[PDB]
Write a protein that binds this ligand. Structure first.
Ligand SMILES: *[C@@H]1O[C@H](CO)[C@@H](O[C@@H]2O[C@H](CO)[C@@H](O)[C@H](O)[C@H]2NC(C)=O)[C@H](O)[C@H]1NC(C)=O
Ligand SMILES: *[C@@H]1O[C@H](CO)[C@@H](O[C@@H]2O[C@H](CO)[C@@H](O)[C@H](O)[C@H]2NC(C)=O)[C@H](O)[C@H]1NC(C)=O
Ligand SMILES: *[C@@H]1O[C@H](CO)[C@@H](O[C@@H]2O[C@H](CO)[C@@H](O)[C@H](O)[C@H]2NC(C)=O)[C@H](O)[C@H]1NC(C)=O
Ligand SMILES: *[C@@H]1O[C@H](CO)[C@@H](O[C@@H]2O[C@H](CO)[C@@H](O)[C@H](O)[C@H]2NC(C)=O)[C@H](O)[C@H]1NC(C)=O
Ligand SMILES: *[C@@H]1O[C@H](CO)[C@@H](O[C@@H]2O[C@H](CO)[C@@H](O)[C@H](O)[C@H]2NC(C)=O)[C@H](O)[C@H]1NC(C)=O
Ligand SMILES: *[C@@H]1O[C@H](CO)[C@@H](O[C@@H]2O[C@H](CO)[C@@H](O)[C@H](O)[C@H]2NC(C)=O)[C@H](O)[C@H]1NC(C)=O
Ligand SMILES: *[C@@H]1O[C@H](CO)[C@@H](O)[C@H](O)[C@H]1NC(C)=O
Lengths: 208, 269, 84
């Protein structure tokens, strides 16, 4: 609403096109080595045999200018086509579904996107998730119990200083370590960083 | 195209505004080069430092981290790479970012990915011991983390050997950097042929401006000057168009490099 | 003042380091205060507290909306030779 200059790309595309047309038109007023830049006068000032020479000069100059203009247009069109292909991919992947490739649309974990129209382009509003308010903890890679080693099915072990819990990785939410969120593999004599603790199972108290 | 001659400039003045367009195109190309480098490398907000004590579960990054001993603060591999690859109205402008700054970006990115993982690419860098970051990365390709904790030393040794092998391959085997050399050679050849084109008559009586200017009558001297002028304009326009094509191709390559940096360095693909 | 990019007059060199306002070259650029010229600063500086048994876990979150702008078209023009 207030801040300007946020639409530089569309604006400068328009400016480039307008400047190209302006210089192409303004090139019409050049002698190119002839006696005048107006065709009617040189037609009406001297006999044909030299008029053909003058028209030849004018014609070659204007042809060169036109060819230059067209070549520039082709280059710019190729660039715009590349941009449009990128926009189509972004619309298909970030608007019609949730994307996993990092930083493709938005900085952070992508949640969704919305499109809006603009005079010669498109504007994507990316809605993303950003974690905050960190906190440090002490961690271990596995837990010893009865000589066996336990690893978390999903999450990570942490301790606040006295007790150990498992949490999901992206949001602090501790839970008691149980035989339902951990799995066993071999004895604990090879892993570097194992810590002693206890793992509670929810069947023994129920049975009694 | 005039080489400090009043008559040439006066005769050229009636050709409209041609070389203004050429200067505009070249300026656009240079600005694009700076934007390319900025987009590829300035992927981070802060500048991270690796801790003085280095115990990454047995992994060894000494060959890739910078060493304070050298003044450029570059790494071993970067020094190998830098050693392997090696006026008439035209100028070469220096890049905006000097080499030390680019090395500093690379060092920051690499320290961040060693210590934090992919977290520093989304929010604030969060520390994580390297072994369990590797366990997470195994978990993302279909292998249980269990495996890594029981084959840690073997994995570390394999990684170290691979690093040493790639270092030796770069150090001994040459011609591994063909692309950069090709770019440099193409630019040099184009500039050289543009310069050498100045020694052509293009149908006039001499390829030197002073002799034709100071030998005979102006009335036809202007015709000779016109011959020289049109030839040199054609050469210059051809040069500029080639430069534009090459710039477009390089920009495509740089966009690809930016995507690869974003997707394979700051995350797991 | 003399710089690797050339010779600069009308501004004074300082020993500070801020962000880059008007890029001059060779890693230096200028800004207005009088006009001063300085060396770029790549950003802030921090040393993340690495250790082999310490982790950091977020406790809260924010939801951010950002914008991206892409051109997709340009004006269609046509030229008549013989009339031009
Ligand atoms: C670590 O967390 C545990 C679990 O929340 C804490 O242990 C309990 O803390 C509450 C609150 O002080 C007490 O009412 C309970 O009696 C504690 N024990 C149990 C078995 O619930 C522990 O205090 C925390 N320690 C630190 C340093 O934060
Ligand atoms: C974490 O790192 C510290 C320091 O690098 C380790 O502490 C050393 O452990 C070894 C073997 O356990 C001892 O021989 C040293 O005397 C210890 N030194 C210090 C200063 O503590 C610690 O063992 C590591 N922990 C894990 C789980 O890898
Ligand atoms: C965790 O528990 C194990 C077993 O309860 C401990 O291992 C014993 O340690 C004592 C003293 O260090 C030795 O005399 C025993 O031979 C060890 N084995 C057994 C089966 O008792 C271990 O020290 C405890 N602590 C840690 C950090 O692992
Ligand atoms: C990481 O690998 C490098 C390989 O270069 C080790 O550096 C070598 O260390 C040995 C042992 O002192 C020396 O004999 C070599 O001269 C070193 N090579 C170089 C090029 O300096 C380094 O020691 C390894 N890291 C650790 C912690 O051992
Ligand atoms: C988590 O605890 C560690 C251990 O203290 C913190 O690392 C240092 O903490 C002290 C305060 O106890 C600070 O003065 C240091 O600056 C910290 N180290 C560094 C390199 O900055 C760590 O900062 C704590 N994490 C958080 C988020 O506060
Ligand atoms: C997570 O952050 C939000 C803010 O983004 C916290 O909500 C604020 O809480 C304070 C104190 O209760 C209020 O004064 C603010 O008005 C709240 N903001 C909003 C937008 O509602 C929230 O408390 C944080 N989570 C936790 C667990 O503290
Ligand atoms: C800036 O630092 C240099 C050396 O780093 C020193 O010689 C100079 O006196 C300092 N001040 C100014 C104004 O240059």
């Amino acid at each position: 609403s207030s801040t300007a200059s946020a639409l530089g790309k569309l604006q400068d595309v328009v400016n480039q096109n307008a400047q190209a047309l302006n210089t192409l038109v303004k090139q019409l007023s050049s002698n190119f080595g002839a006696i005048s830049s107006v065709l009617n006068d040189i037609l009406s000032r001297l006999d044909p045999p030299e008029a053909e020479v003058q028209i030849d000069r004018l014609i070659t100059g204007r042809l060169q200018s036109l060819q230059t203009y067209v070549t520039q247009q082709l280059i710019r069109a190729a660039e715009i086509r590349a941009s449009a292909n990128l926009a189509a991919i972004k619309m298909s992947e970030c608007v019609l579904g949730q994307s996993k490739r990092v930083d493709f649309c938005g900085k952070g974990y992508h949640l969704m996107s919305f499109p809006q129209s603009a005079p010669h382009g498109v504007v994507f509003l990316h809605v993303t998730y950003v974690p905050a308010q960190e906190k440090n903890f002490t961690t271990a890679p596995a837990i010893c119990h009865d000589g066996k080693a336990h690893f978390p099915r999903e999450g990570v072990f942490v301790s606040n200083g006295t007790h150990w819990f498992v949490t999901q990785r992206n949001f602090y939410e501790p839970q008691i370590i149980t035989t339902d969120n951990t799995f066993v593999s071999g004895n604990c004599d090879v892993v570097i960083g194992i810590v002693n603790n206890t793992v509670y199972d929810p069947l023994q108290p129920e049975l009694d | 195209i005039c080489g400090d001659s009043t008559e040439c400039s006066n005769l050229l003045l009636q050709y409209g505004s041609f070389c203004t367009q050429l200067n505009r195109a070249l300026t656009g190309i240079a600005v694009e080069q700076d934007k390319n480098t900025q987009e590829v490398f300035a992927q981070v907000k802060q500048i991270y430092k690796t801790p003085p004590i280095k115990d990454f579960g047995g992994f060894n990054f000494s060959q890739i981290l910078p060493d304070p001993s050298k003044p450029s603060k570059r790494s071993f591999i970067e020094d190998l790479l830098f050693n392997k690859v090696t006026f008439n109205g035209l100028t070469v402008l220096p890049p905006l970012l000097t080499d030390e700054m680019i090395a500093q970006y690379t060092s920051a990115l690499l320290a961040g990915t060693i210590t934090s993982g992919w977290t520093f690419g989304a929010g604030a860098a969060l520390q994580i011991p390297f072994a369990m970051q590797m366990a997470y990365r195994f978990n993302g390709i279909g292998v249980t983390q269990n495996v890594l904790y029981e084959n840690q030393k073997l994995i570390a040794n394999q990684f170290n050997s691979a690093i040493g092998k790639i270092q030796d391959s770069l150090s001994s085997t040459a011609s591994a950097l063909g692309k950069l050399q090709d770019v440099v050679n193409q630019n040099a050849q184009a500039l050289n042929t543009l310069v050498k084109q100045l020694s052509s008559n293009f149908g006039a009586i001499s390829s030197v401006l002073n002799d034709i200017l100071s030998r005979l009558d102006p009335p036809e001297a202007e015709v000779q000057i016109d011959r020289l002028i049109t030839g040199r304009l054609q050469s210059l326009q051809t040069y500029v168009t080639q430069q534009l094509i090459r710039a477009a191709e390089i920009r495509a390559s740089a966009n690809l490099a930016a995507i690869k940096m974003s997707e394979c360095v700051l995350g797991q693909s | 003042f003399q710089t690797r990019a050339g010779c600069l007059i009308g501004a004074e060199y300082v020993n500070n380091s801020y962000e880059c306002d008007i890029p001059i070259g060779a890693g230096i650029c200028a800004s207005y205060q009088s006009i001063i010229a300085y060396t770029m600063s790549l950003g802030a500086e921090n040393s993340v507290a690495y250790s082999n048994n310490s982790i950091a876990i977020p406790t809260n979150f924010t939801i951010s909306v950002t914008t991206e702008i892409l051109p997709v078209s340009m004006t269609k023009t046509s030229v008549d030779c013989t009339m031009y």
